[PDB]
Swiss-Prot record, chains A, B, C, D, E, F:
Gene3D superfamilies in alphabetical order: P-loop containing nucleotide triphosphate hydrolases
UniProt function note: Can catalyze the hydrolysis of ATP in the presence of single-stranded DNA, the ATP-dependent uptake of single-stranded DNA by duplex DNA, and the ATP-dependent hybridization of homologous single-stranded DNAs. It interacts with LexA causing its activation and leading to its autocatalytic cleavage. Probably involved in base excision repair.
Protein name listed in UniProt: Protein RecA
Chief location of this protein within or outside the cell: cytoplasm
Chain residues that bind ATP: 64-71
Pfam family for this entry, one: RecA_C
Subcellular location: Cytoplasm
Assigned GO CC terms: cytoplasm
CDD domains attached to this UniProt entry: RecA (cd00983)
InterPro entries named in the record: AAA+_ATPase, DNA_recomb/repair_RecA, DNA_recomb/repair_RecA_CS, P-loop_NTPase, RecA-like_C, RecA-like_N, RecA_ATP-bd, RecA_C_sf
Family: Belongs to the RecA family.
UniProt KW keywords: ATP-binding, Cytoplasm, DNA damage, DNA recombination, DNA repair, DNA-binding, Nucleotide-binding, SOS response
Length: 298, 298, 298, 298, 298, 298
């Protein structure tokens, strides 16, 4: 009646011995897996992701319908990796990157490495060369579908992926490089090699601004199946501050009392609008609350 | 003319001697096979299943079209196994589990063990480790198709299944673990190793609520080929109470007189709506009628 | 010029001496082989079969495309064997038996013995145990293809069949058990061991009701190569009465005069519809005409 | 320079002394070997066969692809043997004989002897018993492939054939029985024992009607390697009349003058259609032209 | 330093004394062995063969894959032997000879002697009787593999060949008969008894026309190991004229000057096409150039 | 403790007195046996062979799988014997010699003596006549297996070999003729009569070019069991220069300094490719380095 609760954590261990940490876990368990992260920019999503952002040295797949927020999300991450002093690369087979918007998302466009390959083989190879340099923080692949095989310009891409993803995965596990694959819905190789899989899609009616639900359909670094609903406004992206003020208030990082918000024993505005607007004027403050929240999740 | 009726039950015995109980039986025979069960939540189905729920220590396959009710059914069972104080595990290769809905089905999400393997081998292996712990009541595999072989990322999965199912079956026979395999329609190994096979598919036009027929196409624990038609309403699942009030009334567990229902020499509502609503307010009552009906089938 | 006609029947005899009755025969010859039969329910087919139904103590193969009528035919036969007071068994490796329909075909579902084996060996073995009891009238095997070998869960089933069919054939020859094997198109062992082989397939366009041609491609009990075209209506099966009224009229068992039908010097309806409807109201009558027709063929 | 032409016919003789008539011959030589024949129904083929039809007391192999015309040809021959007052037998291991079609080919179905053996040994044995009766004109074996050995239900059939064909050949040489073996492409024993080997296969595109080339790849009774192209129309068979009107016209048996055909100093139609149609109305005439053409070839 | 060059030609002589002319020779030596020949039709091959065609009184083996050109080559030779007024024979155990094609190769079909034996013994015996007549120029055996032993209808054919080839070789050495054995790849007896062995196989991609390389892997009448690449066009055979115009031009038999060809101080066309076409219209000319080239090689 | 080291070299002497030099030796001993050699073309192999090439007046067996390099090696040797002004002979019972390739290996095809015997006796006899002339430098026998006995066209070849090898060995010991026997794996007579036995077989995966290991499994002229791994490229043979540049560099015959190669106090290229390419342009140089290396080994 009790030695039962024992056999359970024993099998968990055996399973983790045989297949590694994260191979099996209770959905309500506290993650705590030791991995380096790259924040998405929206702390709630970082919180839902359990470990605080997308895991370095691992593959992350972001999929869903077109206009859903995949590219926005992806860019938000490089913007974050660059602000931390990192170097990112964009492997483009789509030809749709808007730099103006990418800058509106905080991406340093001029320092962004871009490659537009002739074929899927080449793309994966260019991806490998970079990650093998150990000096790249984030590599975004856009997109999985566009990655057509060389000879095709009988199901060789399903194998191209499997073949290269296998090779890429081994080397990547030890580089601190977060590899992001965008998928508009070979994905079967990705489905199993990815450590994280984000389902991104718009919900409801627009307003200029739309709401997009993001679900962690797969997470081998923390409990999966947690979701978040963010606000994606045209030309601006996901409203990170609204997200920040909300989550920091809930964690008591910023004290809220009815409609009154304060930080550091100092009133910073009444109502979310005034308060998110107060932080918007102080980068110092935004950053500090951001690290406080990051640190807390972690 | 009479010693004939003898030769018949003699061959039945020989057949059962050689291949075990349930190897052959008259379709109208009273089951009565001594096996532990895990209720599906819908008593009619428990009744159709002959032995009161899906059999522990055995494999159960639930198949049919997508959106048919397979996952709902499966979750209903773990919800039931947990409410009885058990521990369940979900082996996911599909990446579609909605916890909110799983909770709406009565599943304790936080205590639910989840695994999202890299390949079919790994999945079956993780399944084995758990069942071998003897502390797991229900393991759900979702799904059979997604269980792609390792090397494939020439028909190795048909053998992977046969190979592991063989091994799993032996050990499982003595663990009190009910293993559920969901199948969207290697299944040939399952077809023969499964002790129970449920055909689940929607029938007719929706209403928010749809009707799904469930047939016991295979039953090695009780007479096969019995079917049931349940109501599956969006976000709620199968209407268990409607099923309960109906079946308990028919068994005289709850007395019905025209449109008048009563329980314990005490009126509990006029009409099914009022009566299912009366039970809905008393968990004590729902449970007691539930055990009374279970006990009766058994 | 005449002693020729002699040498012919002499060789026929020698051939029948060496290999048994039915080893060779003129296609237009009157069967008359002394064997017990189990009516198919459609008298024309019983007539085409020469000896009045499928032969007891022998193997009968029913093959053709799926949805062709094989299972319907098979069930019709057990329905017939049961109505004569017999006991039948169904060896199922397909898992598709619809009891509701089986009852709509006249099968006593509750008294029907059912077995759902783990492998082809087991199935054939269960078949043997039953037939060896000498108390089983009809055993249906569904189906030949599904009968996969044990070790397979290099062409062992072609030998499994040959091996068991050989053994089964010897014992069966003396049991009064009619063994039916359904085949969706090891069949090479069956092809040669079967005494009767029915080709069943739908012809033309449906109407709810479809027409199915049934040919006696093999008959070692009566002249082979006779065919019949029956009406198979959804949920009902083959229209036996239409067949009955037609064949009985042609044999003068029921007198027809233009559109006027009569039986026992008594008018029973004008037109087939009215007449088949008249018999449909009198089981006594249907049965008596049925035995009269049976007796005549025989 | 001349005594050379002598040594040639001397060796031919020696060769024929040692191995019999037909052991060697010039491809353009006039057959004239004294043997009884059974017409194929198509006079051109009878003409190509050199001796007027397939040779009695000898073996004839008819091979080629399925749907090529082998069975049609074979049936045409029995139809011919029966019309001459003979008795034929069909040894079937294929189970595909369509009597309706066989009648459409002129075969008297009711007087046709049929045997459907349990094994290749039995078939050959039944073949022997019949031919040994000396009262059988044509025996058709369908087919060589289906003739599987008894014990097989290590290359025993290649020997079964060799063994029985050897025995059959000796006795057959003196019975006036024409033995036909159909072969879908043990055949190595046949290849050498057959006195005639017909290659039958469809050529070109259909029209209901298809063209089939028939080549005498082996002929030990007349010059080999002559071929014919016949018209095989569905349900009807090879167009014998078209063949007849054509060949009789060329032999001046029926006078043709441009588009004008006449017979017996009497006009019988303008154009082949009208003329073949004129003969089609007079069996007396068809037969007489048929014997006139036969007699001529011979 | 010089008496060395002497010992060499002395041993050559001794070797030739002991085993005959051709027992040993320098690969670049001028053949010049006095033997009668039968041209292959392609002068290059006649030239490669050293002595101008296949040697009479000797055995020649032609082997290689099916569809390689063996039969074409063989027929080309009889066509040549007949045009010189000779008589040829074809010993067929394959049953594939197409006379139409044989005529398209220049073979006089009607005067071609054909034999289709019952067994390998018989074939070799028929071969002997003919060659012993001293009136046969070419005997083709098709093929070595098909030549199955009598008793086989333990390695008796390897001995059958050795036994008969030994006997055949002695008598043949003095008959002017060229014996050709076709071999699809007992051949070990042939390998050593053959005086010439031609390796015939297609090379590269087709065009209707294919290229076939022919190598003299064995030549006891002239230097071995010379090869030729001919053009084999469907229904036509090896393009002899193209070969002729090419080789005659190189030998100055027909003068070529750039794209200008002339013969007998008379222009005969510009370019090979026009020139081979000019000869194609004048048999007189083709023949004369043919003998001029033959005479030259010789 | 010291007079021991004496008894050892004393027995060695006695053994060499009784059976000759090379009868026993330390595996690390310096060969130095006075024998004339014929270089293989690959200096490493000449070095591994201890005495600089295959020994004249002795027998050398080259064996291994087909396509291993045996024939290539053998031809390389005659190419070498001819370049030194010698005369070689090829005794062929295989019929596979490609002169084009033989020329690509440096063999003067026109001056190469070729014999294609009727039987093993004849081959060995022809071998004897030549070697007895004392004017032949290299005789290659291809191959041992093909050398079938005369009467065989009970183990007479095992004796044929023993019989002739015995005779051949005595005379050969004094002729300066190097006899090479190729063996595809009577070989037992060879095994013991051979003074050298080379094991030749490909190792690993191809590249056009394959690697072949050659081991001196038997050496009665120098320490046995030394091996070499050469590069055999299609149509070219063993890469002799690569071998040459490598071995000469190691012997300081050509100075290497990192990636810098020089010869005669003069830079000849950076890297092996450039350097082997520099020698490839100067036959004078290749030869001189070749003799320098030869001389050194010797
Ligand atoms: N270049 C842009 N300029 C301004 N707003 C943009 C731009 N791109 C995207 N957006 C906004 O962000 C929303 C989602 O676009 P993205 O994230 O690219 O969509 P996605 O999920 O990447 O789908 P695709 O197939 O890549 S377009 C758009 O509907 C706009 O609201
Ligand atoms: N996440 C959900 N939230 C609300 N309702 C759901 C949800 N999932 C399923 N349902 C309801 O239950 C029905 C059947 O869904 P499921 O049982 O998952 O289907 P299924 O048979 O498992 O098919 P798949 O292939 O697994 S989706 C749906 O049509 C809805 O009516
Ligand atoms: N369960 C059923 N309920 C109502 N009608 C049925 C049922 N099964 C069969 N039928 C009717 O009978 C026809 C033939 O079905 P069956 O005889 O099972 O076919 P079959 O030849 O057995 O082919 P399979 O492969 O067994 S489905 C169907 O097309 C329907 O017209
Ligand atoms: N039963 C039939 N009814 C109508 N036409 C037929 C029938 N059988 C054959 N035919 C016609 O004759 C053609 C050749 O059929 P057959 O001679 O049986 O072929 P075959 O050469 O015997 O090949 P198999 O393998 O025996 S079917 C068919 O394509 C039809 O044109
Ligand atoms: N009967 C034919 N009619 C037209 N072209 C032919 C014929 N036979 C052969 N050919 C042509 O000649 C080529 C070689 O055929 P053959 O010389 O018979 O081959 P082969 O080397 O004799 O091989 P097998 O095994 O005898 S078929 C064919 O691929 C065609 O290009
Ligand atoms: N005629 C050739 N033309 C081009 N390359 C050749 C030729 N012969 C051999 N080679 C090359 O050399 C390799 C070895 O062939 P050889 O030395 O003949 O083999 P082997 O050891 O003699 O085996 P066998 O049984 O004599 S073929 C081949 O795989 C090719 O890479």
């Amino acid at each position: 009646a009790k030695e039962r609760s024992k056999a359970i954590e024993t099998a968990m261990s055996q399973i983790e011995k045989a297949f590694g940490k994260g191979s099996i876990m209770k959905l309500g368990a506290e993650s705590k897996l030791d991995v380096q992260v790259v924040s998405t920019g929206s702390l709630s999503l970082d919180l839902a992701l359990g470990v605080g952002g997308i895991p370095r040295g691992r593959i992350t797949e972001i999929y869903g319908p077109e206009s859903g927020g995949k590219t926005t999300l992806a860019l938000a991450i490089v913007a974050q990796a660059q602000k931390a002093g990192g170097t990112c690369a964009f492997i483009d087979a789509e030809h749709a990157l808007d730099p103006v918007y990418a800058r509106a998302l905080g991406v340093n466009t001029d320092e962004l490495l871009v490659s537009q390959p002739d074929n899927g083989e080449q793309a994966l190879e260019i991806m490998e060369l970079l990650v093998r340099s150990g000096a790249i923080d984030v590599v975004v692949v856009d997109s999985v579908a566009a990655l057509t095989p060389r000879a095709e310009i009988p199901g060789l891409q399903a194998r191209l992926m499997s073949q290269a993803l296998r090779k890429l995965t081994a080397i990547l596990s030890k580089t601190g490089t977060a590899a992001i694959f965008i998928n508009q819905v070979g994905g079967r190789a990705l489905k199993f090699y990815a450590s994280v899989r984000l389902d991104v899609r718009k919900i409801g009616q627009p307003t200029v601004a739309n709401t997009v639900k993001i679900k962690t359909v797969k997470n081998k670094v923390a409990a999966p199946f947690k979701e978040v609903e963010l606000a994606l406004v045209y030309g601006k992206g996901f409203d990170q501050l609204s997200d920040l003020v909300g989550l920091a208030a809930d964690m008591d990082i910023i004290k809220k009392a009815g409609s009154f918000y304060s930080y550091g024993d100092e009133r910073i505005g009444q109502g979310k609008e005034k308060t998110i607007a107060y932080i918007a004027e102080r980068p110092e403050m935004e950053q500090e609350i951001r690290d406080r929240v990051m640190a807390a999740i972690r």
